[PDB]
Amino acid sequence: EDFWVQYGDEMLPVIGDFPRKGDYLPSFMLVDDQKHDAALESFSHTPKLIVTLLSVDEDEHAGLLLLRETRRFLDSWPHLKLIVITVDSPSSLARARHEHGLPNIALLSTLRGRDFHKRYGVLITEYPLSGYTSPAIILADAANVVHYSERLANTRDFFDFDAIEKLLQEGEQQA
Amino acid sequence: MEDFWVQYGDEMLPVIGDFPRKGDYLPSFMLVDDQKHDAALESFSHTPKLIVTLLSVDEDEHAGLLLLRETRRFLDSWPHLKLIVITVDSPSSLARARHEHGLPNIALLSTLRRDFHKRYGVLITEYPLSGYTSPAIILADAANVVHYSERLANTRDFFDFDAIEKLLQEGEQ
Ligand SMILES: [Cl-]
């Protein structure tokens, strides 16, 4: 195994090649919360922050709390498009939007092709998280080149937002 | 050229695979329940069952919660029939729905691990329902033998409960 995520008392392999700094994002064919096809081209000419969560119906285990911390981080970086990807159905993603708002956040489901998981290095095949996307964050520029990527080693953890902030500040003070 | 179609609003979509018929044994499945536990046919031992595929527990009028509630209402007269609901929803969403919508006894199974979809003849591949389970109902006995099966032709329709009731009544007599 290349990677493990801790979920309560279980330690589960995470499978596939997770994108790294300097990589171009792998292509994807997903479906959004209104059942529309979503590809990288759907988010053209914008930098983005891609986040995989276990599901929008988890709370402490890589769910709505982590999403919330990520939204809060992005108060400082309004030009960064937040793209949330999960195994949830489009119908459930639409319900989450209705119930929680999630302004300007894209919500994408892997149901149209679950091979997204291996291609993005977030595939879990063991009980109890079999079929889920392991929680991860990827910062990419408008050319879809990766500047930062991290997979969580434990589902209760938060991403290293301080590390992402430092990269964004360093870029800004350059320009 | 298709064997079956489902109407979803103004969209008419092919449904793919071999749908179980009267006298068939249920095909095996390997699903995951709303508490993230493996669920196989043998998980529902010694019981007749009513298997329903819905689009999602988070749909309302389109083969979703309204159809689920009508199905459970119908089953109130048939205390031995276990209701098993299967969707593409996540276990996490199914668990939330159970609490949010008051569904204490139903088995709620996710297909997240489309092998099921095709083996049960409920697979949709076309926009905008690509990857969903087409809505359907299967009545099976404790031997897992099918007594009645129906795929909805339109997502806003109800199953033919009258036809199911008649078979169950003819059974009890
Ligand atoms: Cl119930």
Specify the experimental method.
X-ray
The full 3-state SS of B73-121, as one line of letters, equals HHHCCCCCCEEEEEECCCHHHHHHHHHHHCCCCCEEEECCCCHHHHHCC
The answer to whether A130 contacts B87, with C-beta atoms less than 8 Å apart, is no
Return phi, psi of residue B117, to 5°. -55, -50
Counting Cβ atoms within 10 Å, is residue A27 exposed (0-12), middle (13-18) or buried (19+)? Answer: exposed
CB atoms within 10 A of CB B102: 8
- Of residues A64, A86, A71, the one with CA closest to residue A136: A86
The full 3-state SS of A62-113, as one line of letters, equals CCHHHHHHHHHHHHHCCCCEEEEEECCCHHHHHHHHHHHCCCCCEEEECCCC
Q: Which residue from A54, A112, A113 is facing B92, i.e. has the nearest CB?
A: A54
**Under a CB-based contact definition with an 8 Å cutoff, are residues B112 and B66 in contact?**
no
Distance (Å, rounded) from C-alpha B19 to C-alpha A96?
Answer: 32
**Under a CB-based contact definition with an 8 Å cutoff, are residues B29 and B119 in contact?**
yes
Q: Which residue from A55, A63, A91 is facing B59, i.e. has the nearest CB?
A: A91
**Under a CB-based contact definition with an 8 Å cutoff, are residues A133 and A52 in contact?**
yes
Q: CB-based contact (8 Å) between A9 and chain B?
A: no
Give the amino acid at A97. Answer: R
Token pair for residue B105? 């006894």
**Under a CB-based contact definition with an 8 Å cutoff, are residues A144 and A27 in contact?**
no
Return phi, psi of residue A92, to 5°. -65, -35
B-chain CB neighbours of A111 within 8 Å are 88, 130-132
Q: Domain span at residue A166?
A: 1-175
Q: CB-based contact (8 Å) between B55 and chain A?
A: yes
- Bridge-partner residues for B108, per DSSP? B85
Token pair for residue A98? 């209705």
The answer to whether A31 contacts B131, with C-beta atoms less than 8 Å apart, is yes
A-chain CB neighbours of B92 within 8 Å are 54-58, 63, 88
B102 C-alpha to center of ligand 1: Å?
7
Q: Report chain A's terminal Cα–Cα distance, integer Å.
A: 40
Q: CB-based contact (8 Å) between B129 and chain A?
A: yes
Residue A137 sits in a domain whose CATH number is: 3.40.30.10
Distance (Å, rounded) from C-alpha A26 to C-alpha A19?
Answer: 8
Distance (Å, rounded) from C-alpha B82 to C-alpha B72?
Answer: 10
Helices (H), chain B: 65-75, 91-101, 115-119, 161-172
Q: CB-based contact (8 Å) between B9 and chain A?
A: no
Distance from CA of A41 to the nearest CA of B (A): 18
Number of domains in chain A: 1
What resolution (Å)? 1.8
Per-position DSSP letters for A102-161, written without gaps between them: -TT-EEEESTT-TTHHHHTT-B--STTSTTPBPPEEEEE-TT-BEEEEEE-SBTT----H
Q: Which residues contact B22 (CB under 8 A, 6 or more apart)?
A: B146, B147, B148, B149
The pairing of beta strand A48-52 with beta strand A136-140: antiparallel
**Under a CB-based contact definition with an 8 Å cutoff, are residues A140 and A147 in contact?**
yes
Q: Which residue from B36, B58, B110 is facing A91, i.e. has the nearest CB?
A: B58
Distance (Å, rounded) from C-alpha A28 to C-alpha A134?
Answer: 16
Q: Which residues contact A70 (CB under 8 A, 6 or more apart)?
A: A49, A51, A82, A137, A159, A161
Q: Report chain B's terminal Cα–Cα distance, integer Å.
A: 42
